[PDB]
Amino acid sequence: MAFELVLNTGRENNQAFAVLHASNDLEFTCQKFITEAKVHFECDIVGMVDNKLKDQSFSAFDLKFIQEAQKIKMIILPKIQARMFDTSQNIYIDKELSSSSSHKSKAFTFIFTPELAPIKDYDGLDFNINFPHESLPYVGALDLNSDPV
Amino acid sequence: LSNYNLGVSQMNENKFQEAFESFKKAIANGENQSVAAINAAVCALKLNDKEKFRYYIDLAQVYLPKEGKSKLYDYYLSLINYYKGYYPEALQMLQRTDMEPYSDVAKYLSAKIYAKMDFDSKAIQQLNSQGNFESSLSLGLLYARIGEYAKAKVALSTAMKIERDFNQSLAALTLVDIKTGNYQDMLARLQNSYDNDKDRYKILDAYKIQVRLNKDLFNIAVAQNSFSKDLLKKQKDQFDLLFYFAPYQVFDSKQAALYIKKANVTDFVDDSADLSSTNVKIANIINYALNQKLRLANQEFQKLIKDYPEHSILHYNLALTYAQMQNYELAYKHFSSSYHLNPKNYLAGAFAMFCAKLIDIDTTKLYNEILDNIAADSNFKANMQKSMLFLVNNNYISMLPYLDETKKDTPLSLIFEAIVAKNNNLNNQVDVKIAKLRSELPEDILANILYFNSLNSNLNIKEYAQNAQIHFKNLKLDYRSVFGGPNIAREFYVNLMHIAGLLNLERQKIKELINVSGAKDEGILQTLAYLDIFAQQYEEAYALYNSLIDDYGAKDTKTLFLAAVAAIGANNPNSAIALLQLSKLTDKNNKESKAALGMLYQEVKNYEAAISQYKTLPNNFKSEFFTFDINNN
């Protein structure tokens, strides 16, 4: 199984915080079909050969799998507002942070949180911000217990 | 002194293998398992080995609960989530770290994460809340992304001093200066950085740009604000409206009246300019001009002038046809010729100054000439021209006496009175002047639009749109032939339909009319092209404009400019360059064509010619038609 989902849930203020990470060895696609006031997050995966994959129901989103001939369609129905991100680039090595709004990569992150904000329109230049100071972070000097001197 | 301490103490000396071995020894001994695992993973990542990095990062988690009581627990968890690609978790967990030397690092990493996920404001706030790392370049880039160029310039200028961030900050500041409109500042900055010429071209090669149409053209709110409140409060609009209603000069009005079918002949023809064949030719071409056929009349006047090259009236008529056609330089030429061949034609001189003001040129000599000729005359029965002479200067008090005169009513007089009343905040008599104007001209598009905008001005957007829809629903227009006069009538009709959100239905109506039969006139095609440009349908507009140029005669400055606009909309930078060069060949000092040409040359990567066009622009100029965006792919 070269394709992996991980789910992490948590609390912020008094809300819900769901994060779904999808990864594969090859590049696959995910899109944000809107329909009518009901976002359906649809992912296309080559999948190689897979067995019967049962569908689970979760607090913030529902999952569905469709298995065609050597093709997998992942359907995500969010019960709350959801957003998509392409966290394929390794930030912890790189200094030129690219854009996270891409429709094809080897790692995708879906975020579910009730108290979100609508995307605003800013008249600006789509620069790639350069962070030149902290590239490979590490922990400094410590004692026999994990605590700074 | 400890194994972990010894490893980390070697590790900041840029010695990675020995430190990694020390970390392995510390992990084997069993001292500070989690932090040793994280540092060993980062050391392994210093060299080129991804598998070992992944193995050690995965191993780091299983010892984490052992160090459950540690004031740096938040930082360790955030780092572990940071190297695994789980970024939102790391961002959510990084805000709880309040230790002394790591709070700034936590805030910097949070800024990185926010910047990745397109939350620029939070990233700016996090970077500003930091006082350990110099984040001038990142702050400037983020400010540019948000759209606050005023602080972006300061941040980038601060970052320019450091040697490492020289080239990138220079390129970013150059692009920001282009975006804001300060061109001479950009050129001065470029000239003081390098001494060679190739090096200065490489700064413009850092970021690839892409030309785009301005988003402010399609905003309904701004169009309504500028249309229903400041219709006559603009020099270009004032001059265009004066040109529309201006009269056409003849020798004898009585002879010309028998050759024109308008029912308002006495209002659009004047004989104040101090052969029978010349009279009849003038009358025929004027009839062609007034009955919604402008291009053919302009061509006929141009052809007939070559036969008789000394007649003050003919130059005025050709110049008027050019001026109503948004061809201002030839209008200047022929207006000046007309005034120089007869210095008692004051309307010709006034229109010459108007045209010379619309393009960029000095006209003080002409103003003094007409002023001297005014002060030395036996009679001055024409005071309208004297009042009009003040319009070039940005003063309006001087025409206040004109509103108290015993006057014959012609549409030029009414529109001039409306301009004068509106420009002195006398917003009450504007309505009565416009009402009289509409009463004078029943079957006119522009009069109807003006009356509607005067009557329904004091409303909101929704009421304006609903009234407009109701008003034009019951209004029937012969679309085939009525949009064939001066360009301002179409432009204003398209703008009003854009405000009311009705231009899609009108677009469908005009298409159906076009598809009913075959070859037709120019007016419908130009109106449909303009509607397509204003409906964000660029491919059809570009095809229509190419058909206009290559099928009928469309070698005009305005038509070529609009074709270039459509081509830029349809992602054709190469054709836009040729079209804009051909447009500029006549109107040399066109401030909007030059900026677009410079941007297009920068996009095609021709920096030798990009600076040439930028060198001919002022330090304060915001193009209302073109902008650029950074191409990241």
PDB file of C-alpha atoms in Angstrom, chain A residues 4 6 8 11 17 19 21 83 85-87 89-94 96-100 109 111 122-148, chain B residues 4-5 8 11 31-32 35 39 42 45-46 53 67 69-70 72 76 82-83 86-89 92 99 102 105 108 111-112 115-117 133-134 138 141-142 144-147 149 164 168 172 179 207 628 630 632:
ATOM      1  CA  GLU A   4      -1.626   6.605   3.105  1.00  0.00           C
ATOM      2  CA  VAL A   6      -3.536  10.057   8.514  1.00  0.00           C
ATOM      3  CA  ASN A   8      -5.426  14.190  13.498  1.00  0.00           C
ATOM      4  CA  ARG A  11      -9.389  21.465  20.015  1.00  0.00           C
ATOM      5  CA  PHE A  17      -9.766  20.924  14.461  1.00  0.00           C
ATOM      6  CA  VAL A  19      -6.474  17.616   9.680  1.00  0.00           C
ATOM      7  CA  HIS A  21      -2.965  14.158   5.341  1.00  0.00           C
ATOM      8  CA  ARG A  83     -10.041  23.912   2.800  1.00  0.00           C
ATOM      9  CA  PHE A  85      -3.490  22.794   0.776  1.00  0.00           C
ATOM     10  CA  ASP A  86      -0.538  21.410  -1.188  1.00  0.00           C
ATOM     11  CA  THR A  87       2.134  20.813   1.456  1.00  0.00           C
ATOM     12  CA  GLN A  89       7.396  21.305  -0.682  1.00  0.00           C
ATOM     13  CA  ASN A  90       9.711  20.763   2.278  1.00  0.00           C
ATOM     14  CA  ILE A  91       9.650  24.077   4.139  1.00  0.00           C
ATOM     15  CA  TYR A  92      12.246  22.897   6.665  1.00  0.00           C
ATOM     16  CA  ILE A  93      14.970  22.745   3.980  1.00  0.00           C
ATOM     17  CA  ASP A  94      13.868  25.394   1.504  1.00  0.00           C
ATOM     18  CA  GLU A  96      11.783  30.080  -1.412  1.00  0.00           C
ATOM     19  CA  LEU A  97       8.291  29.179  -0.227  1.00  0.00           C
ATOM     20  CA  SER A  98       6.150  28.472  -3.288  1.00  0.00           C
ATOM     21  CA  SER A  99       2.346  28.474  -3.488  1.00  0.00           C
ATOM     22  CA  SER A 100       0.136  25.891  -1.796  1.00  0.00           C
ATOM     23  CA  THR A 109      -3.555  18.466   3.496  1.00  0.00           C
ATOM     24  CA  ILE A 111      -8.206  21.270   7.030  1.00  0.00           C
ATOM     25  CA  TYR A 122      -6.009  41.454  -2.384  1.00  0.00           C
ATOM     26  CA  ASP A 123      -4.561  43.527  -5.221  1.00  0.00           C
ATOM     27  CA  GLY A 124      -0.946  42.437  -4.907  1.00  0.00           C
ATOM     28  CA  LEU A 125       2.020  40.665  -6.488  1.00  0.00           C
ATOM     29  CA  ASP A 126       2.284  36.885  -6.058  1.00  0.00           C
ATOM     30  CA  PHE A 127       5.837  36.916  -4.751  1.00  0.00           C
ATOM     31  CA  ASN A 128       7.649  33.905  -3.321  1.00  0.00           C
ATOM     32  CA  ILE A 129       8.651  34.996   0.172  1.00  0.00           C
ATOM     33  CA  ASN A 130      12.304  34.317   1.008  1.00  0.00           C
ATOM     34  CA  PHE A 131      13.086  33.229   4.570  1.00  0.00           C
ATOM     35  CA  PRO A 132      16.910  33.149   4.773  1.00  0.00           C
ATOM     36  CA  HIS A 133      17.612  32.794   8.507  1.00  0.00           C
ATOM     37  CA  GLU A 134      16.220  29.545   9.973  1.00  0.00           C
ATOM     38  CA  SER A 135      16.628  26.699   7.479  1.00  0.00           C
ATOM     39  CA  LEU A 136      17.363  23.555   9.531  1.00  0.00           C
ATOM     40  CA  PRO A 137      16.157  24.196  13.096  1.00  0.00           C
ATOM     41  CA  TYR A 138      17.471  22.216  16.040  1.00  0.00           C
ATOM     42  CA  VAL A 139      17.466  22.209  19.824  1.00  0.00           C
ATOM     43  CA  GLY A 140      20.251  23.981  21.691  1.00  0.00           C
ATOM     44  CA  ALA A 141      22.203  22.892  24.738  1.00  0.00           C
ATOM     45  CA  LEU A 142      20.241  20.973  27.370  1.00  0.00           C
ATOM     46  CA  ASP A 143      20.734  19.212  30.693  1.00  0.00           C
ATOM     47  CA  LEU A 144      20.331  15.530  31.571  1.00  0.00           C
ATOM     48  CA  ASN A 145      16.624  16.388  31.530  1.00  0.00           C
ATOM     49  CA  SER A 146      15.048  18.182  28.579  1.00  0.00           C
ATOM     50  CA  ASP A 147      15.340  21.787  29.790  1.00  0.00           C
ATOM     51  CA  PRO A 148      17.564  24.726  28.788  1.00  0.00           C
TER      52      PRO A 148
ATOM     53  CA  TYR B   4      24.353  15.002  23.837  1.00  0.00           C
ATOM     54  CA  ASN B   5      25.957  18.282  24.889  1.00  0.00           C
ATOM     55  CA  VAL B   8      25.553  19.521  19.848  1.00  0.00           C
ATOM     56  CA  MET B  11      27.510  20.266  15.619  1.00  0.00           C
ATOM     57  CA  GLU B  31      20.360  10.215  27.644  1.00  0.00           C
ATOM     58  CA  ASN B  32      17.892  12.788  26.284  1.00  0.00           C
ATOM     59  CA  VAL B  35      16.082  15.708  21.588  1.00  0.00           C
ATOM     60  CA  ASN B  39      19.273  16.584  16.405  1.00  0.00           C
ATOM     61  CA  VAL B  42      18.783  17.180  11.360  1.00  0.00           C
ATOM     62  CA  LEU B  45      19.692  15.799   6.746  1.00  0.00           C
ATOM     63  CA  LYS B  46      22.795  18.007   6.618  1.00  0.00           C
ATOM     64  CA  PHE B  53      16.364  11.135   8.237  1.00  0.00           C
ATOM     65  CA  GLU B  67      10.131  13.442  28.368  1.00  0.00           C
ATOM     66  CA  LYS B  69       7.600  16.854  32.000  1.00  0.00           C
ATOM     67  CA  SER B  70       9.711  19.374  30.089  1.00  0.00           C
ATOM     68  CA  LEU B  72      10.228  22.694  25.985  1.00  0.00           C
ATOM     69  CA  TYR B  76       9.842  19.356  20.619  1.00  0.00           C
ATOM     70  CA  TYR B  82       7.538  20.126  11.356  1.00  0.00           C
ATOM     71  CA  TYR B  83       9.848  17.549   9.757  1.00  0.00           C
ATOM     72  CA  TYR B  86       2.272  17.926   9.365  1.00  0.00           C
ATOM     73  CA  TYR B  87       2.329  21.709   9.173  1.00  0.00           C
ATOM     74  CA  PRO B  88      -1.059  22.858  10.584  1.00  0.00           C
ATOM     75  CA  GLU B  89      -0.472  20.793  13.721  1.00  0.00           C
ATOM     76  CA  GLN B  92      -1.185  25.202  16.247  1.00  0.00           C
ATOM     77  CA  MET B  99      10.835  29.900  26.485  1.00  0.00           C
ATOM     78  CA  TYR B 102      13.202  29.718  21.275  1.00  0.00           C
ATOM     79  CA  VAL B 105      12.458  30.859  16.441  1.00  0.00           C
ATOM     80  CA  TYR B 108       9.727  32.674  12.656  1.00  0.00           C
ATOM     81  CA  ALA B 111       5.541  32.979   9.917  1.00  0.00           C
ATOM     82  CA  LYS B 112       6.935  30.458   7.431  1.00  0.00           C
ATOM     83  CA  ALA B 115       3.177  32.232   4.407  1.00  0.00           C
ATOM     84  CA  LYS B 116       2.949  28.745   2.912  1.00  0.00           C
ATOM     85  CA  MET B 117      -0.805  28.513   3.575  1.00  0.00           C
ATOM     86  CA  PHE B 133      15.918  37.940  13.280  1.00  0.00           C
ATOM     87  CA  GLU B 134      16.131  40.674  10.655  1.00  0.00           C
ATOM     88  CA  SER B 138      10.359  38.751   3.957  1.00  0.00           C
ATOM     89  CA  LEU B 141       7.602  40.599   0.021  1.00  0.00           C
ATOM     90  CA  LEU B 142       4.610  39.843   2.260  1.00  0.00           C
ATOM     91  CA  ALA B 144       3.726  43.421  -1.608  1.00  0.00           C
ATOM     92  CA  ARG B 145       1.613  40.257  -1.615  1.00  0.00           C
ATOM     93  CA  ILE B 146      -1.077  41.883   0.550  1.00  0.00           C
ATOM     94  CA  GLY B 147      -1.075  45.122  -1.429  1.00  0.00           C
ATOM     95  CA  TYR B 149       3.078  49.094  -1.253  1.00  0.00           C
ATOM     96  CA  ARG B 164      23.095  38.897   0.523  1.00  0.00           C
ATOM     97  CA  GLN B 168      16.223  40.039  -5.006  1.00  0.00           C
ATOM     98  CA  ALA B 172      11.184  43.303  -6.054  1.00  0.00           C
ATOM     99  CA  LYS B 179       3.079  48.552 -10.197  1.00  0.00           C
ATOM    100  CA  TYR B 207      10.840  37.498 -11.891  1.00  0.00           C
ATOM    101  CA  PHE B 628       0.936  42.904 -14.415  1.00  0.00           C
ATOM    102  CA  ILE B 630       4.021  37.536 -11.368  1.00  0.00           C
ATOM    103  CA  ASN B 632       5.261  31.512 -10.914  1.00  0.00           C
TER     104      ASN B 632
END
